[PDB]
A paper describes a structure:
The mbd cluster encodes the anaerobic degradation of 3-methylbenzoate in the β-proteobacterium Azoarcus sp. CIB. The three-dimensional structure of MbdR has been solved revealing a conformation similar to that of other TetR family transcriptional regulators. The members of the TetR family are mostly repressors, and MbdR behaves also as a transcriptional repressor of the mbd genes responsible for the anaerobic catabolism of 3-methylbenzoate. In vivo and in vitro experiments revealed that 3-methylbenzoyl-CoA, the first intermediate of the mbd catabolic pathway, is the cognate inducer molecule that interacts with the MbdR repressor allowing transcription from the PO and PB1 promoters.
Author numbering:
A (entry chain A), B (entry chain A): 15 to 47, 50 to 206
Write the structure that this text describes.
């Protein structure tokens, strides 16, 4: 709990300030603690640990929940969309780390970025598989590759979350979910 | 040109390192220059100036190009999508600033973030208007608000760009454009 307390405060600070601006001193004060160094040697160690939490909450569960959704790929896609929305409400900080730590701009450095890139690819792979299945079933269109279509699904998902970070006083994590689902399934055209 | 040289190098560095890790010393060395301080008093000043460039390249042109696209809203949406793809190929760094400087995680601070948030909203507004027009025309669906649908279009766009930053050796700025257009217009379902 002293450990959870550290991780959660770090996570809040990274999200509000960025990784570079956040310091162990700041995390320690917020967490209510020298103490911090005995749990984690460095700030580094703290982000890496946060990435593992993210993988556990966001990514580890996907294979089973997808397998068990159905009967066809459309129901599975809806399930993925609904699970992501739920994570966006309840664990948005973890989601944001996966989306942004996995690019240079975040300022974490290559070791941390590489771990996030890997976790992202694991998630994406499940989406690409789902799309491919639907194409086999005749549920989803086949005029584009499952790889490209999956990227679109992940891109929309990433953007929606970032948009909450952009305008929290005007929307919630769920505000955009129906529109997201509607567009991904049937598009804008009547 | 000495000014362009500074801005372009700063922009490259911010994108690769993040804003906080980048220093005027680093920008000055890359740019081939005390000199820097006479053009720009601070790093700050440099990002703000980059935000103005971004508004000029990305946002200022939208109203006219949209007005002149047609005849109906579908053609206009395609035009917006194609223009954004083009910016993603040619001025990706500027696009990335608008998407990410407009949230806390980027680490720029409130003044800079607020300017980016404003520029973003201006772009979004044009998209919301386009969607609303299409709804009036009977081209686009009306079971969701034009505000929510517009957010989905912007979200997909933001994510696609970030995905290039994520995996540049596996895709280009254009790789995802057909799939993006296809999904936004007609969705995944056959």
């Amino acid at each position: 709990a002293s450990t959870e307390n550290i991780l959660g405060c770090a996570l809040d600070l990274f999200v509000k300030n960025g990784y570079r601006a956040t310091t162990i001193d700041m995390i320690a004060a917020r967490a209510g603690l020298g103490a911090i160094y005995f749990y984690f040697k460095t700030k580094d160690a703290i982000m890496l640990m946060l990435l593992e939490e993210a993988e556990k909450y966001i990514v580890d569960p996907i294979d089973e929940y997808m397998a068990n959704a159905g009967p066809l790929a459309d129901a599975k896609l809806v399930k993925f969309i609904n699970m992501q929305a739920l994570l966006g409400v309840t664990k948005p900080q973890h989601v944001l780390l996966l989306i942004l730590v996995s690019i240079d701009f975040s300022g974490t450095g290559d070791d941390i970025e590489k771990r996030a890139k890997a976790i992202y690819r694991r998630m994406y792979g499940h989406v690409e598989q789902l799309i491919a299945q639907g194409q086999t079933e005749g549920v989803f269109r086949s005029d584009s590759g499952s790889d490209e279509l999956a990227s679109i699904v992940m891109a929309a998902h990433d953007g929606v979350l970032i948009e909450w970070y952009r305008r929290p006083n005007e929307l919630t994590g769920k505000t955009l979910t129906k529109a997201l689902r509607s567009v991904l399934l049937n598009g804008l055209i009547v």
